[PDB]
Design a protein around this nucleic acid. Sequence first.
DNA 1: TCTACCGATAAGCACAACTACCTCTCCTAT
RNA 2: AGGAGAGGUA
DNA 3: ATAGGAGGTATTGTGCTTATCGGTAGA
Lengths: 76, 97, 57, 174, 113, 109, 401, 56
Amino acid sequence: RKTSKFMTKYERARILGTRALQISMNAPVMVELEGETDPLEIAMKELRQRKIPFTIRRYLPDGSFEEWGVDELIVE
Amino acid sequence: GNADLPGTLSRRLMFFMRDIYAAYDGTVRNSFGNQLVQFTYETDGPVEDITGEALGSLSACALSEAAYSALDQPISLLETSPLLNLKNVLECGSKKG
Amino acid sequence: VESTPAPFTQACFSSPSQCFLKAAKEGVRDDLQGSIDALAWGKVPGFGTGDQFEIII
Amino acid sequence: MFIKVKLPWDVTIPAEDMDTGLMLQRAIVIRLLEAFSKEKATKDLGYLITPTILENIGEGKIKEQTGEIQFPVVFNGICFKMFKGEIVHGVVHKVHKTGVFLKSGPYEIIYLSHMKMPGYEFIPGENPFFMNQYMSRIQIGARVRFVVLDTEWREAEKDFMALASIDGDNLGPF
Amino acid sequence: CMMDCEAFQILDGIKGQLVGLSEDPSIKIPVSYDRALAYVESCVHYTNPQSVRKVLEPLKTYGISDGEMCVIANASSESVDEVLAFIPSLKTKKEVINQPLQDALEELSKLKK
Amino acid sequence: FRNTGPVHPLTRQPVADRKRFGGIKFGEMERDCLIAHGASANLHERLFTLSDSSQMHICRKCKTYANGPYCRVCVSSDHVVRVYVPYGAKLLCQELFSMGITLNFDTKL
Amino acid sequence: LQVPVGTLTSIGFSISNNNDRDKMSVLEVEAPNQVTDSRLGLPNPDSVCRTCGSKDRKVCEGHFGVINFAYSIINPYFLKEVAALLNKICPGCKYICRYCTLNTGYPLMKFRVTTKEVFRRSGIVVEVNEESLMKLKKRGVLTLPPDYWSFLPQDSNIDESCLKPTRRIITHAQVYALLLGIDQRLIKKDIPMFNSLGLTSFPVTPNGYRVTEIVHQFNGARLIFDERTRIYKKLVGFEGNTLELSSRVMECMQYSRLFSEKLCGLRFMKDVLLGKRSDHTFRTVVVGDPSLKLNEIGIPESIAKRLQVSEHLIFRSLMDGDTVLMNRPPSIHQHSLIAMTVRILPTTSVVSLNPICCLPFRGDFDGDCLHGYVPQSIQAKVELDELVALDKQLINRQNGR
Amino acid sequence: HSIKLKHTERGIVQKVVLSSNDEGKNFAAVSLRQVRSPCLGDKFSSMHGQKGVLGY
DNA sequence: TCTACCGATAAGCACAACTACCTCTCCTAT
RNA sequence: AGGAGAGGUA
DNA sequence: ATAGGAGGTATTGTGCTTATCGGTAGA
Ligand SMILES: [Mg+2]
Ligand SMILES: [Zn+2]
Ligand SMILES: [Zn+2]
Ligand SMILES: [Zn+2]
């Protein structure tokens, strides 16, 4: 709660990088990709299909934190 | 020989404004102790989606651009160059005497 | 005035020796809150990337 | 002192197999098995065999190197502590002139010194040396009870070596 | 808490689980399994319910520490002179009469047929 | 251009000689610009990974520096943590110890 | 063996004492000729380390050694605090007394530290106020009373100075004598670090950071070593007056790289921690090529085949589709850093850039050189074209145009 | 010992000169020559202050 | 009437007087 | 191999 | 270990830390 409920560019880039690193280490892909040979493309496809099993923990300055998920958040 | 002024001014301003960043609550806070600099960003619109960008770093870079661009340094009699005027304006605590 | 001790950033700004000596005499504690302090010790600044964390579940 | 105490761990799981959410618990236990298997040793705790009971699991922390994710899991298991003043039986493996071997399980090696049992003369007239001077025959395979002493440890192997003393009563096989 | 009886019962489960899906994609260690088969074959009890309950009865009725129970149970002394010579913590004590201890020795004798 | 080459004897950094496969210095202005852009992985790699990379051992019990690792201030302890810091940090710590300043480190893990 | 990883935080600052100095030092001998011992550092002329294993100055750290002093030495950093404290408290009354009342004829005393003015020694020299001396002079008193300096115990470390009867150099032994009888609360308030009052040892720089075993042109094994090393070796044999030893220690402490005097002070910080050099970097002259796209950078085939990138299947040559970080020094704005896709061109020893993209770099094709950075980590590449790419920087952040 | 050419050193041997001083120290000089055709990155200047590099 | 700090006037003391850079020559006492 | 001094580039 | 008189001349520039220099205010 008390959040913009919008995925920022930095968080999206970090999620894409983490997913690409995971895929590049021979990891199964939740989404089905046809004719894809680049981990970045598969990560972007999964982000567009919001099937990534990742959760975002936003640290508030006061010390508290709020737990969010990539499926709950929207991508502009 | 006076090309050191923009570099030194930019370095000092960046050292001062590096810790400034925007928080998730919409406030502007400093990295040292979460000090509140601005309760709400004073931008005149139109998009308020900036959350993690370092506003202080951007402002310091813009002022560095202004300083480096104004390197003509005419320094006329009874007058000061735009770089000198910017340096005098940015330094307020030094001119206490 | 803010009661925030940053010996490392002050030393990196100007006169590192005097700043370090004063910090040692005062026995202050540095929390590495600054971005430059984190960078000098191999840590992310946390402004754009690093402010949040990723958890599988 | 076979008290089943809890022991937290920070087992890391490679990103080679991260799928099957409905059967994700299958991958967690497999990684836990490979955790203590790699070490298979302890300094002052003892030994662990199987994770019979799993208490709780923690949040998955992601560390950005070689695609590794960590999971904090706390569980209870079988442990053994060699406390001072314990009568533990053991089986003999071989008999030598010095350092008589006693095997109280393959988890540790126990050596018998000269100043532990009653004074006797080694019998060289047969193949294995006998200690029948005090009307007691000891051979390989017989269970002999003895008191344990302070145990030592190594640097790499960290073997829980100890010394066997027969100064107590009820010596020899029973 | 498992000394001789409950330790053996749970080890049958893993052996019964080993026969099912014995294949493992990872690398296993044979030292751990050898330490279980070559250590519990010293002393074995018959039944679980009546054995773990009986040994815990003197804990409530009499005053015995946790560390004292483990050494006495594993040693399984068959007389009164041995329990007064093994552990030095029982020297010069009159808290418990020897006659109830002898009765407990008989109670431990009938459990092992 | 440079891929791999000799390092300076004082600091474990690429030499400035062009003929000896020298590197390009990552100045303060470039670091500040990268901070303004908000990319930390590139900045972390350029300052720690591709730059002078070293390791330092800190005892968990006593907040001191231990040279396996072993600190003579306290007894031989099995709880010693390793931190990943640039070699410049170790050089600064050595200089501070030489001048008469002792640093205490309290690791969070 | 194996140690768990950890995160460094909460750095504390304190002044070193004798206990920590002794604990940190390993195999600290007291031989004057063993300054370059084989147990401290690899660059010693034996190529063998006693504490660590054999290495190539990459797996062995610089061990520390601390010499021992026969007599206790006051800490130079606390010299000002002690001098200020002695000025307030009487030298013979130990209260906040012949030295109290002005009717007894004893003038007040001022405690101060001289800096290379009398005997080139940074010590405690007590001085009497000359204004009070003139008052005594006008009343018929010409010389100080013989029992004026009765509060100073006799010290064998005193030498022949003969400077003036009004001024005396306070011996380090006398400093501890005067501090006796003072409440610990007052001393602790002025001096937060009471445990560092006594300096009975001094560390030496490791051979891995002092032994300059440079190739010395022809003398490959010259072992020139550091310069302060001579002073440290000369400090092994200490006897007689302790003021000379204190002056030597103070002089040696000023040879540290942090103290200002080229690689010293703030320049040391800039060249070590602030400014660093990284691998996988190329620097070539840039020319114009309108045929190339704005987001594409021309990379010569001769250099591309030698630059190696890290791709998980271990290095492969640079090819089309890879992204590099271009920058024109000095970086006057954040728009200087632009991520551009690598495009292979038949041209060699030169990089081709679109003339339109010169405005963000604020440069022209007259000799300007662009040095690029090739990211090796996959995450670095992913974040490079999502935040630092040309299409992401279409809106100027200065004026919004 | 021997002296080897560096990464960016190349040419064809033109002449070798051997000489010594009165002290007896021997000196050796080797000259390497090469042709520098106008490359793309070369910079040319005019007689009136015009400065530029080769474009195409 | 004699103490008791209390702001001014000189006298030294300490950093700061720019980036990315590239070549040549000379240097290591007696 | 590290330094000191000069002429120079954007 | 020894050696390297003596000369009128011809960087600023800002902060900081003294000393000293009288100088009134209170009992
Ligand atoms: Mg130009
Ligand atoms: Zn320790
Ligand atoms: Zn070593
Ligand atoms: Zn007094």
